[PDB]
């Protein structure tokens, strides 16, 4: 009704002159936001010996009070590639480790996983045994030493290996014919694969896993959960900040 | 033949957001065609093409009754940290960033019965000593008269007015880049009905959208919950 | 395929002024248009287009009285470390550099009343055994006769005369590149007035500007205060 300004008639609104651009919406770009390293997960090393289990790279159903957790939960289907940074931080005395090789093995979505120490290295009496699936071969094996290491880390890029054209972040159905409470929001292979960290350190320290998601694509936006509580009616939340009145 | 190279002091460090990729170890994987509808590339677009309902006292609406007048029915300070903007998409998306720029579009939807009618005065009050308490006070400001029964829905744009090019997403004790004023809605007339025993009150749903000039910059990490 | 590289011995060192940038970690920030008047790009321009007042005994001027003659009213040695150049823009800007080149422009402004008059002789005396004590001595040098009452202001250029292409900003015990001589101002006649009881003295403000050929090179760090 009437539309634009200053007569005050019913339905009439005053003039507004829209602002000019400046930032160009570059920062709200989906793939820009996800192409950075995020500290998601922290994990323990397995001993060289025994029958270790692989850790699945699935950052999807998180509750973590971190920016990547909510963000990954903003869409229904997701596709992206992956980059990893694995670091190693001592939890004991750094002089406990004189060599400290760490074998990292990455497995594509669908890879077989049973391993037991099976590859023997021999030298002057004593010997060392590594896992059947830690050896360098078909899938990537990375070996880094923690001892004098200036960064006690490694890192590499890996692609989207799932069989699904897109990863369902939410799934209204079951991933298996038997409909068990377990296979509910499920679907097999809705992830990035799995890794196996193995080392004579294992005690002595842990890791720090960071994910970077290059080439991200999101489908079907979903509601974004709050993050903070609701302040009192008619008030404003007040947070500590850079700006703030001294 | 070996190239003379000098190692920078920041040498073996991490730096999380480097503009460069790591070395690939599992080449040549061709990915299946992903048809699938509804891909979005920028969060600002879904914020602009979509509306959420505000949280007025925990409900997505304010009420007019057959007894109203003077006092403001809805009042919220213009800051993304405002309470009534709590459950919204725009407010929630904002927590990922440090600064915002632009307008917010609010649209009120009167859901009182067809046999019901009322008129509202909605005002945008700029920063001031203390917020008006009655409508005769606020009506000196930018305002619009919404006569339901002409249009059941009404859109009002809260403008961006500030000496700074961007304002803060995360508010705190009032600063010059913290708050931009208040949005208030008054009842120009109380609810009238065909039978006050059947319809005594009507609810106005209030929804928010990012305005056409709205923008967000500076991605930030989540602080301790509060 | 891995490239043969040889690490230089100065390898992991710092070197503060390297002609190169560090790695960026927060890309793509478009900055708001900064209109704002009065941007300056080179300090030498503001030094040349601007004047400051000297510090003659703590005041920005020297005085002539109805009793003057012979003796110099103003005397300063030509060195940026001179005392009377103390509070000035040109002197202060200079402390950021090791060497200077060029002339200085001094302009005297007679602020004695309109009913007052006097004549000055201003001389540039080159390095010498010891500085003239009377004007008949100095008048053998480069000098100009300023008759107030012809022009109330007078500009005089102290030239650059030296076998070196630049001289030192930071002076010390006299060296061949430390000092360039003296600037003196004498009273050719004492102040005359319409009534000596009303106006007995008049003050000449003295201001300095960088000359057209003035320049500064070699940025230097600030030493212990003195």
């Amino acid at each position: 009704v009437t539309n634009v300004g200053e007569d005050g008639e019913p339905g009439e609104t005053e003039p507004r002159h829209a602002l000019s651009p400046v930032d160009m919406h570059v920062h709200t770009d989906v793939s820009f936001l996800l192409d950075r390293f995020f500290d998601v997960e922290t994990l323990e090393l397995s001993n060289l010996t025994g029958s270790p289990a692989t850790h699945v790279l699935d950052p999807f159903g998180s509750t973590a009070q971190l920016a990547w957790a909510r963000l990954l939960n903003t869409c229904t289907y997701f596709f992206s590639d992956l980059e990893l940074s694995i670091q190693f931080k001592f939890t004991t005395t750094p002089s406990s480790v004189g060599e400290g090789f760490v074998w990292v093995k990455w497995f594509p979505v669908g890879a077989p996983t049973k391993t037991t120490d099976a590859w023997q290295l021999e030298g002057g009496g004593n010997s060392v045994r590594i896992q059947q699936l830690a050896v360098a071969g078909m899938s990537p094996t990375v070996v880094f030493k923690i001892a004098g290491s200036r960064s006690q880390a490694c890192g590499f890029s890996v692609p989207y290996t799932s069989m699904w054209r897109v990863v369902p972040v939410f799934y209204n159905g079951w991933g298996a014919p038997t409909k068990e409470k377990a296979t509910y929001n499920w679907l097999p292979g809705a992830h990035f694969g799995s890794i196996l960290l193995t080392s004579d350190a294992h005690d002595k320290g842990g890791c720090y896993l960071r994910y970077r998601f290059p080439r991200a694509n999101m489908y079907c936006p979903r509601p974004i959960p709050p993050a903070f509580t609701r302040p009192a009616d008619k008030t404003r939340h007040k947070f500590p900040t850079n700006i703030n009145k001294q | 033949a070996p190239i003379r190279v000098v190692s920078v002091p920041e040498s073996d460090s991490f730096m999380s957001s480097v503009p460069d990729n790591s070395t690939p170890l599992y080449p040549k994987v061709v990915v299946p065609p992903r048809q699938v509808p509804g891909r979005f590339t920028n969060f600002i677009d879904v914020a602009k093409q979509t509306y959420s309902f505000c949280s007025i006292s925990g409900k997505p609406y304010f009420e007019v009754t057959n007894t109203s007048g003077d006092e403001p029915l809805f009042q919220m300070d213009v800051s993304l940290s405002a309470a009534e903007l709590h459950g919204t998409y725009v407010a929630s998306l904002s927590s990922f960033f440090a600064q915002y720029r632009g307008s917010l579009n609010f649209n009120f939807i009167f859901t009182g019965a067809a046999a019901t009618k009322a008129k509202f005065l909605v005002a945008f009050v700029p920063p001031h000593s203390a917020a008006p308490k009655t409508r005769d006070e606020a009506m000196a400001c930018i305002h619009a008269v919404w006569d339901v029964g002409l249009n059941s829905a009404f859109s009002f744009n809260v403008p961006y007015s500030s000496p700074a090019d961007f304002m803060a997403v995360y508010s705190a004790e009032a600063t010059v880049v913290n708050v931009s004023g208040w949005l208030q809605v008054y009842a120009l007339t109380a609810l009238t009905s065909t039978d006050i025993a059947v319809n005594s009150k009507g609810r106005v749903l209030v929804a928010v959208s990012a305005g056409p000039d709205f923008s967000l910059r500076h991605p930030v990490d989540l602080p301790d919950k509060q | 395929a891995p490239i043969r590289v040889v690490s230089v011995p100065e390898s992991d060192s710092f070197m503060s002024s390297v002609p190169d940038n560090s790695t960026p970690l927060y890309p793509k920030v478009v900055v708001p248009p900064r209109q704002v008047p009065g941007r300056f790009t080179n300090f030498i321009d503001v030094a040349k287009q601007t004047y400051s007042f000297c510090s003659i005994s703590g005041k920005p001027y020297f005085e002539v009285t109805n009793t003057s003659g012979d003796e110099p009213l103003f005397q300063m040695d030509v060195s940026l470390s001179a005392a009377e150049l103390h509070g000035t823009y040109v002197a202060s800007l200079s402390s950021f550099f090791a060497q200077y080149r060029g002339s200085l422009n001094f302009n005297f402004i007679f602020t004695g009343a309109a009913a007052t008059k006097a004549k000055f002789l201003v001389a540039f005396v080159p390095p010498h055994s010891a500085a003239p004590k009377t004007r008949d001595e100095a008048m053998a040098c480069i000098h100009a006769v300023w008759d107030v009452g012809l022009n109330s202001a007078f500009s005089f250029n102290v030239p650059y005369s030296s076998p070196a292409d630049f001289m030192a900003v930071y002076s010390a015990e006299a060296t061949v590149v430390n000092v360039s001589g003296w600037l003196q101002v004498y009273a050719l006649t004492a102040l005359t007035s319409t009534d000596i009881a009303v106006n007995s003295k008049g003050r000449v403000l003295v201001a300095v500007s960088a000359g057209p050929d003035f320049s500064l090179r070699h940025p230097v760090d600030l030493p212990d205060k003195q």
Binding site: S31, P159 | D20, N21, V29, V30, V31, P33 | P27
Partner: peptide, 21 residues
């Protein structure tokens, strides 16, 4: 989005990432 080195293509487009069909 977020790859700004001239050296981002030190490895071919088919080795560095996946390829859409």
């Amino acid at each position: 989005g977020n790859s700004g080195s001239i050296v981002q293509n030190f490895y071919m487009q088919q080795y560095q990432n996946s390829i859409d069909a």
